[PDB]
Amino acid sequence: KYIEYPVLQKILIGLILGAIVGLILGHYGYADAVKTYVKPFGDLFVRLLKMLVMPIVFASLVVGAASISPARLGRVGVKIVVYYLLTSAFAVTLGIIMARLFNPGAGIHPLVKILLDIVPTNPFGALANGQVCPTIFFAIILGIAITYLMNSENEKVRKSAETLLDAINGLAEAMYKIVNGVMQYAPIGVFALIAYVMAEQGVKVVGELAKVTAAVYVGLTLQILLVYFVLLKIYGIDPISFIKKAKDAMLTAFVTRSSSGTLPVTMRVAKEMGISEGIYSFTLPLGATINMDGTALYQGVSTFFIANALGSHLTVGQQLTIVLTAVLASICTAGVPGAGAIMLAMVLESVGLPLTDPNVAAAYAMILGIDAILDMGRTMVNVTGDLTGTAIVAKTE
Amino acid sequence: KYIEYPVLQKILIGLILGAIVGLILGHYGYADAVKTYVKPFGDLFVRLLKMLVMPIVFASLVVGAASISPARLGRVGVKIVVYYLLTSAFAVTLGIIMARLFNPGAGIHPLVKILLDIVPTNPFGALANGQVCPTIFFAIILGIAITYLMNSENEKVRKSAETLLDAINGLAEAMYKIVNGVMQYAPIGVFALIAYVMAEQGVKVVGELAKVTAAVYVGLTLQILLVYFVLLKIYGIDPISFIKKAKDAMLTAFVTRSSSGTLPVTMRVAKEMGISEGIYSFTLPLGATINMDGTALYQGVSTFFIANALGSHLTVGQQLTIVLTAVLASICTAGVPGAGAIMLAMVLESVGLPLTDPNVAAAYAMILGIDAILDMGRTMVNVTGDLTGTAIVAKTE
Amino acid sequence: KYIEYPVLQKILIGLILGAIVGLILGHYGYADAVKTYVKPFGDLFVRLLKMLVMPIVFASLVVGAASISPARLGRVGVKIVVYYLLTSAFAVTLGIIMARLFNPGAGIHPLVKILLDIVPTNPFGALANGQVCPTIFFAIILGIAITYLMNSENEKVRKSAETLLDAINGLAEAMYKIVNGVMQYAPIGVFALIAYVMAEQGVKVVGELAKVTAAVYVGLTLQILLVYFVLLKIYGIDPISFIKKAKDAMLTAFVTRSSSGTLPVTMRVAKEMGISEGIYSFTLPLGATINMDGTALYQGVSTFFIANALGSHLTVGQQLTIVLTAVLASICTAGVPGAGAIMLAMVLESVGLPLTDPNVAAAYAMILGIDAILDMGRTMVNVTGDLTGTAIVAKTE
Numbered sequence A, B, C: 001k002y003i004e005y006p007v008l009q010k011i012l013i014g015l016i017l018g019a020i021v022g023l024i025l026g027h028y029g030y031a032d033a034v035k036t037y038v039k040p041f042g043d044l045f046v047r048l049l050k051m052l053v054m055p056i057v058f059a060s061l062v063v064g065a066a067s068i069s070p071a072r073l074g075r076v077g078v079k080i081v082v083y084y085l086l087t088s089a090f091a092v093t094l095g096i097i098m099a100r101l102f103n104p105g106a107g108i109h110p111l112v113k114i115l116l117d118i119v120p121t122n123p124f125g126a127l128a129n130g131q132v133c134p135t136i137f138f139a140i141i142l143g144i145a146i147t148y149l150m151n152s153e154n155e156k157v158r159k160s161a162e163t164l165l166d167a168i169n170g171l172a173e174a175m176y177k178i179v180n181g182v183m184q185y186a187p188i189g190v191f192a193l194i195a196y197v198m199a200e201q202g203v204k205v206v207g208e209l210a211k212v213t214a215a216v217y218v219g220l221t222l223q224i225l226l227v228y229f230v231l232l233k234i235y236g237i238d239p240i241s242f243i244k245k246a247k248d249a250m251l252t253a254f255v256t257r258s259s260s261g262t263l264p265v266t267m268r269v270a271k272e273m274g275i276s277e278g279i280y281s282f283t284l285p286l287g288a289t290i291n292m293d294g295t296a297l298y299q300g301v302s303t304f305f306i307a308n309a310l311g312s313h314l315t316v317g318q319q320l321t322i323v324l325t326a327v328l329a330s331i332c333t334a335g336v337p338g339a340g341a342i343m344l345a346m347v348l349e350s351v352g353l354p355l356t357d358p359n360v361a362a363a364y365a366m367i368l369g370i371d372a373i374l375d376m377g378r379t380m381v382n383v384t385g386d387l388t389g390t391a392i393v394a395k396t397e
């Protein structure tokens, strides 16, 4: 076939052309037709991303945890989890500071229960029709168990364990190649998605919301620079050299709006920059789904936007409430386009702002449009976080 | 045990005796009692057919697609799919012609969205509690992927892929033997089913609906003769010799009301008449669930019946609407007794006739009774279609 | 780590201390605080028990049935099933006799369809989000099939079958070690559970309900003694010697409120007392979920309690109705804490007493409290039943 260029170049070309077409059709009546024809081609991409998420989450964990002995798992797991949560908190507070400084959108005027829920009442049921988190719990559990079995004395169960582990590993590999296949469609789909967005955008009225956009972007960039360079220089990594390798991943994640299709590319990058394989094999897929701190910063800023549009004022307690809820709601989120808004609703209802009130609903719609733009940034920052965290831990050894 | 005859003979005997008993009890008060005692024995058969459908659909596809290299898959797949759809359209239009000629039942007076839906938003979720079509998509996908893995260079993933494929294949084989087991119950169950039908039937009032029945049967027989003999003689097969082998399958499918229990018998027939194994292994289970064109012709005729009972008149556009909708709704259907009526409702609501209106509901009930008779014919024609299509393609090589 | 004692000792210590703390805090205002802090630690145990139930039911059956040839399966299966049902009936009638004698709680004033339901309309769907019983049916089916395949002549399918069976067996083993892991948490959780119960209990008012409690306990103890000693002496087992081994299992089952975590300990006990392995491997996990006759006796007694609180009088027909319904509803039940009450509702609605009427609802709440106490007894008697039944059958050979 004739599509033979390398992937990222293809996607970039598609993005560019889609933006141009969206603008020039925006001026004229064709701005309507594009909805009917183009959007279907876009949605077909989105769905293909959701499909591949669920199998890669379960399987890849099970293999990863199985490969490592339990003690080493203890050490690496605690280090990494501590780092993940701390950085997420740092990110959302940085976002709140940005919101306070810019003050966007002024316009015109069970807390234990959720921590208990993480344990699956039923594994198959939660796996098929339920949530991400419980599958993570069950996967790690099963991996540890299979390890102990492989040490066992009796050959019968030893052979059984080996073959089970091999089956699950096979499922994982297959899903990765499926991802490559989807990326070939990705240029066409990206073209469609961005074209519809640009055609709906009216620039100068969007200019008011652009103050929101500026707050968000400045927050994201500040996070990258400040946090990751400070940490890398404390532990002793040359940041520009790290970013050199990261750049491929970050580009792929910026143009595509998946935190998950990026995963195999990320693992290639990890193999290139010479890291102990098992460590990244375990930590990276866990990170792909926990390290959505960019989405956390966004959620904080948007919570402040909606609050400012409603006109409320927040105590220290309510701002702490935002912070904690945002961490947990980010952990609950799933790695696919647009999802961050659906979880933003969770945190809003936590703080006490109803999604069904029409005034705030209108403001929310305004934000939902620009969410498509902000999504690209969020994804870039997420993959950055993954790579940095793994590199740090590996440097400690 | 004492049931030792060959299967088809057993089923035929059961059918005959059940019909006789239904008639002679129909004359007298016992016509009531049979509902309570006999129907339960019948339902227990129906359920056993549904159970075995879902696993054989998924598994058998995955193995089939895995066995064949991708290029050959391209060629055979496109040929077969084109043929399937074309013949389905031919069938439903033939049915509309029959309806126009006989004019039965006069009595007394998202289109893209569904094509998008075929992609599963979640594979496990759609597999367990969702539809047929998406499992087909995902199965084919997974098979292709496993093929590429088996070519891969690295032994670890090679062994993993092999073992996964073997597991799935094992599930398939087991389900086939389960089918044989169910067929042993089938004589008893067929006896029950047909007895209840005959006991409910009042012959002379059914005589008016018998004009509907005659239209349907004449349509089916005309389809067999005209379409399949024309095609076979174009490509160069002796039709009576083909039908000789087909006869076993067609009988088994006529007496039993499953398009799926017939599948193993069909594959035996394919092995007998000497066909390239991989080709039929892939094309036949796909055909078992797509080639329900007999049900398509029925759905067209019944749509015209309901329309004539409502008294409406149909433009060229609405008749085209019937045709297209019928193709897609047949593809959505599942291979078990009585299902065709449930999908008939889909096409009716598509054309714009509400199922909840009482007048048309009464007419629909009249048709639902005779649906049990017509089901047998539909199934015969379906298996005919499967065998013919595979034979044609194999003849082209 | 510092928790190094043997399990049962740990659990006993936890139970004791939790009871004491519950009482002494009960006197004072702290009786309130314990709800908030302690209950969460308790629930986290309960959920972990539910999780592990569903996988061990399916997998362990499939392996068991696969190991044994079909003929031997016929013999052992019929013997065991007959025994299970007969003893369940004996138990519930004994309970009704006890209820008549004590007359507790006087206070102040589809039957075929469910038997048909056992067959799964969809296997994956019933497995993930549906019930226990259909998974049992499908599991046994699949096991038999895999056996025949292993006899088959063709090596390809032979290898496939072997590998499938090995996968499923691996899942089983892993789940057993998970059970051990949960038991380490069990002491802490038991402490919490019992403490909350004791803190809610007001002793002297509970003294009236204690007449209910006495009826129940006397019934249970009478069942053990009379039934099992009569049977053991008929077939020729020294009862005290049997109970010697049983004692470990019965203690573990009394302190823990799971009929399922006890299963591996039970199988250890079976290996100790020298029984043919395959026989107990099949019969014991089937028994773990069918032999809940202690819960059956309780359900009968509680049905009479609620009836006496409503003030109704029961014919011979209605008492037979209770008996039959109780057998089936016990079979439907699942092996986890508190479940017996939820199925008690099924039998109540069967007899015709509505759960939504407030008077009987109040009485039901009174019983629901003490259900936590009675649960321990039920579980002890259940594991006794399992061991005795297997021992009897093995003695016949």
Ligand SMILES: N[C@@H](CC(=O)O)C(=O)O
Residues within 6 Å of the ligand: A257, A258, A259, A260, A292, A295, A333, A334, A335, A336, A337, A338, A339, A340, A341, A375, A378, A379, A382
């Ligand atoms: N869906 C994005 C992040 C987000 O916007 O929530 C990803 O994980 O790839």
Ligand SMILES: N[C@@H](CC(=O)O)C(=O)O
Residues within 6 Å of the ligand: B257, B258, B259, B260, B292, B295, B333, B334, B335, B336, B337, B338, B339, B340, B341, B375, B378, B379, B382
């Ligand atoms: N259920 C039939 C066809 C139909 O009547 O819809 C079959 O596929 O066997």
Ligand SMILES: N[C@@H](CC(=O)O)C(=O)O
Residues within 6 Å of the ligand: C257, C258, C259, C260, C292, C295, C333, C334, C335, C336, C337, C338, C339, C340, C341, C375, C378, C379, C382
């Ligand atoms: N849930 C208990 C019995 C019951 O109380 O229903 C068990 O099976 O362990």
